[PDB]
Amino acid sequence: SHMSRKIRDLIESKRFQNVITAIIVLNGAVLGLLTDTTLSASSQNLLERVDQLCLTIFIVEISLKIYAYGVRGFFRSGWNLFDFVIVAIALMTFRIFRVMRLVSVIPTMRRVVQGMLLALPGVGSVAALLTVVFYIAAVMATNLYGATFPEWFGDLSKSLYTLFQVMTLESWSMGIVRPVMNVHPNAWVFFIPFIMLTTLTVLNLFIGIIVDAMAITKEQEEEAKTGHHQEPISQTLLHLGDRLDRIEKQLAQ
Amino acid sequence: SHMSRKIRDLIESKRFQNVITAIIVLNGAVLGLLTDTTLSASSQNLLERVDQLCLTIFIVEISLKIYAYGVRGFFRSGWNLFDFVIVAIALMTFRIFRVMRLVSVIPTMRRVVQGMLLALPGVGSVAALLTVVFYIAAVMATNLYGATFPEWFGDLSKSLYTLFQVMTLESWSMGIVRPVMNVHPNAWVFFIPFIMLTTLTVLNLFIGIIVDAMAITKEQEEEAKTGHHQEPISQTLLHLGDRLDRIEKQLAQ
Amino acid sequence: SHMSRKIRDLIESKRFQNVITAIIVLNGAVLGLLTDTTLSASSQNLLERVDQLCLTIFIVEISLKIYAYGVRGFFRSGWNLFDFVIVAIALMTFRIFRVMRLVSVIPTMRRVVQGMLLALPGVGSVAALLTVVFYIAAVMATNLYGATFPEWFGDLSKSLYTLFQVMTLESWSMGIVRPVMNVHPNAWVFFIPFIMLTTLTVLNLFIGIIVDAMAITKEQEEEAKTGHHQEPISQTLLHLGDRLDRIEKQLAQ
Amino acid sequence: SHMSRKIRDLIESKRFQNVITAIIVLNGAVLGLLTDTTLSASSQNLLERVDQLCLTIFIVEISLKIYAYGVRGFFRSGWNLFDFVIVAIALMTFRIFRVMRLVSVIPTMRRVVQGMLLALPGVGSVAALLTVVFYIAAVMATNLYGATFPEWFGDLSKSLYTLFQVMTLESWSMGIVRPVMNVHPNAWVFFIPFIMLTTLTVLNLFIGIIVDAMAITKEQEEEAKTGHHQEPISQTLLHLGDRLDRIEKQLAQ
C-alpha cells in the first residue's frame, strides 16, 4: 500500500519512461541489425540475446505495473492491454511490431494516435460511401473487362486491386486504361468518373480524419498540461449572453 | 387512415430499415458471386433466384411506401424517386447499381451525399473555369501536336483524354511530354503552364466541394438529431449587439 | 447623352450578356470543329465564315461599349482592355483564346478569376522561395549529374525540366533516381530532400492561393449582390467593446 | 559610437539591402553560367572573377555588420550566423548555396522561412510516428521480400528507399507490388495498408506544418509592420467578460 504507491511513483517517473524508451529503441535497433543476411552466427547469437534481455525488462516493467495498479486497474487502459498483448505474445513472427510501444509509452505520441482513433467514428459514413463505390465499381469492371483483361479484372479481387491502383492514379492511363480502350473504346466513360469520384471521396476522408484528429489531439494536450481545455468560442458566447440577461433583469429592477 | 399510420410506423421503424439494409447487402453479395465465371449452372440459378427474391422484397417495401404516403407524398422525395426508378427499372444492365440503395436507405449515408450535392452549386464557377481551360487546351494541343502525335492529340477527343491524364500527372513527362519535345522542343511552354493551372484549379474545385459538403452535412446531422442547428457565430454576435442596444436605451432613460 | 444611357442600359442588360455568351460559345464550337483534319474545303469555308461573323459581332459590342462609356471610361477596366486586345489582335494564331471571353463576360466567372489574381501578391514570398530552391537545385544537379546523365541534367534548362518532373513525383524513382543511383549511389541524399522540400512548399503555395482566392471571391460575390460584405468577426468584436465603453462611462455618471 | 550609428543606419538602409540583393543574384547568375560545359577558358576566368568580387563585397558587408553591432550583437541572430558561416566557408563545394542569402537578406522571405522552422516543433510527434511506421515497415519488408526481391528490399536501406517511393505512389503497383505478388500473392496485405497509413500521416504532417507556418508568418508580418499582432479572438472574448464583471459589480452597487 505504501509499496504500491512508491512503485506507481517509479512507473509514473520520467526517468523510468526514458529507460523503457531506451530499451524499445535498443530492441528495435537489434531487430534491424538482424535483417542483415551476412551476419556471423555469433553475431546473430549476441543480437538474439540482446533481444531476450529487452523482452525480459519489459516483463518486469509490465509486472511492476499489473501489481502497482492491480489486475483490473491495469487492464482498464487500452494502452496497458496493448502493451500486455504485445509483450505476452512474444512468450508463446513480426517481433518488430514491439517498436510500436514507442507510441504506447511516449505520451505526446500516444495523444497523436488517440486523436486519429477518436476521429475515425465521424468519418465512418464517408468511408462506407467509398467502400460502396469500390464494391460497385469492382463488380462492374469484372463483368465489363474480366474476359478481355483477366490479369487486371478477371475476378472481383483483381478488380478491387486494379481499381485501388487506379484511384491512386498510378499508371492508370498508360498502363491500364489506354490498353483497355484499344479493345473497349468507351472504357474512359467508366474510368474517368471512377477517378473523379474516388479521389474526391478519399480526400474528403483524409481531410476529415486530419482536421478532427488534430483538434482532438490539441484538446488532449491541453488537458494533459493544465487539467482542462479551451472552451469552444460557441459556448464562450452563450455565457456572454447570460451576463447580459442578468444585466437586463437588473436594469428592469 | 389508422392503417396508413401503422404502416408509416413500420416503414419509419429502425427494425424495418435494418431489414431493407440486410436485403440490399444480400442482393449485392449475390451479384458479386455472380461475377465468378467458374460457377455451375445450378449455382448461377440459385443466385439468380436469390436476386428475384431481393427484388421482390423491394417491390413490397416500395408498395408499403407509395401507399402509406400516397402517390404525391412519396414522389415528393428525390430519394423515394431514386429508390423507385432503380427498382422499377429492374422490371422492364448494371443491376449492381441497386447497391446504391444503401445510400438512400441509411440516413447518415444519405446526409453525406446530400452535403456533396448541395455543395455543387457553389463550385459551379470553378468547374466552368476548369472546363474552359480544358476546351481551349484541347483545341490548341490538337492543332499543335495532332499531326505529329495523332494517337495522343489526333482529334479533340484524344486531346481531352490526354490532357486529363496530364492533369492527373500520370506519366505526363516520361510518357507524353518528353516524346513530344523530341519533335517540338518548346512544348514544355504549353504543358508546364497547363499542369500548373489545372492542378491549382482542380484542387480549388475539390477543396471547395469538401469544405462546403462537410459543413452542410454537419448542419443536417444537427437538425436530424435535435430539430435545429448551431446558429452561425456571425448571427450570435448580432444578437449580442441587440442586447446592448436595449441596455444603452434603458441607460439613457 | 440619353443615347449613351440607353445603350449602356443595353450593354448592362442580361439579354445582351446572354447573346455575347452565345456568340463566344459559337465561335468556340466552330474553332473546335476546325481542328478536324478530314473537313471538306467547303465545310472549312462555312466554318471560317461563321468565325468572321462572330468576330464582327464582337467589334460592334466593343464599339457599343467604347462609345457608351468613352475612351477613358472603357479603358478604366482591365477586363474591357482584355476584351479589347483579344478582339483587336484578331484584326492585324491561337484564336481559341477568344473563348477566355467567357470569363470576362460572365460575372461569377470573372469573380473567380479576380479572387485568384488578387491572392497572388500574398503568396509572392512562398513562390520566390520555391523559385530559389529550384534554381539552386538545378545548378547543383547540372554539376553533379550533367556529365553522366546529360539528357536529364546536361544543362541548366534540362535540370529544371527534370526537377519539375521530380517534384510532380512522375516516374521520379523508376525513371530518374534509380538509374542515377546505379552510377552515383548517394544521389538519394540530393533527390529525397529536394522532393520533401518542394512538395511541402508547392502545397503551401497552392493552399495559400486557394484559401485567399476563395475568401476574396466570396466578399466580391457579397458586394455584387448587396453592395457590401460581412464585417470580419475581428471588427464586430471591437464594436462590441465600444458599446461597453459607453456603458461603463454612463455607469460611472 | 556616432560612426557605429551611421553605419547601422547604412546596413539597415533599404538601398543597401537592394544592393546586397543585386549582388546575391549576380553571384547566382554567374554560378549558373558556369554550369555550361562549353565555355572558353577566358569566359570561365571572367565569370570566376565576377564571383571573387561578389564574395569580396559580402566580406565588407559582414564586416560593416560585425563592427556596427559588435561580436556578440551580430552573433545574437541565427541569420547573421548563417550569413557568416556561408560567407566564411568560401574562405577555407556547393557554392550555389550562397544564393540562400536571398532568404536571410530579404525580410518577407526570412519570415516565410521562420514560420516554417517555428512550426516544426508542433509536428514533431506526427513526424516521429511516420518515422516509426517507416522503420517497422522497412524491417518487415526486408525479412519478407529481401531474398526474392533484393534490389528493392535486399537490406534495410533498400527497403526504406523503396517504401519512400511506394508512399509517393510512384510506380508502386506496376513497378513494385504486382511483380512482388507474382511471387508472394498476399503482398497486397502489407503494401496497401502501408500506403493508406503513410499517405494519411504524411499529409497530416504537411497540413500541420503549413497551417501553423502560415499563422506564425502572418503574426510576424503584423509585428514587423505595426510592432504588434492581432489578439486571438480567444482573448478578445475574455476581455469582453471583464467589462461585464465590472458592469455587474457596478450594477450591484
Ligand SMILES: FCOC(C(F)(F)F)C(F)(F)F
Ligand atoms: F534503430 C532504431 O531506431 C528506430 C527505432 F524504432 F528502433 F527506435 C527509429 F527510432 F528510428 F524508429
Ligand SMILES: FCOC(C(F)(F)F)C(F)(F)F
Ligand atoms: F458483399 C456485399 O458487401 C458490399 C455490399 F454493397 F454488398 F453491401 C459492401 F458492403 F462491401 F459494399
Ligand SMILES: FCOC(C(F)(F)F)C(F)(F)F
Ligand atoms: F463547344 C464549345 O463549348 C466550349 C466553349 F468554350 F466553346 F464554350 C465549352 F463551354 F465547353 F467550354
Ligand SMILES: FCOC(C(F)(F)F)C(F)(F)F
Ligand atoms: F540568375 C539568377 O537568378 C536566380 C538567383 F537565385 F540567382 F537569383 C533566381 F532568382 F531565379 F532564383
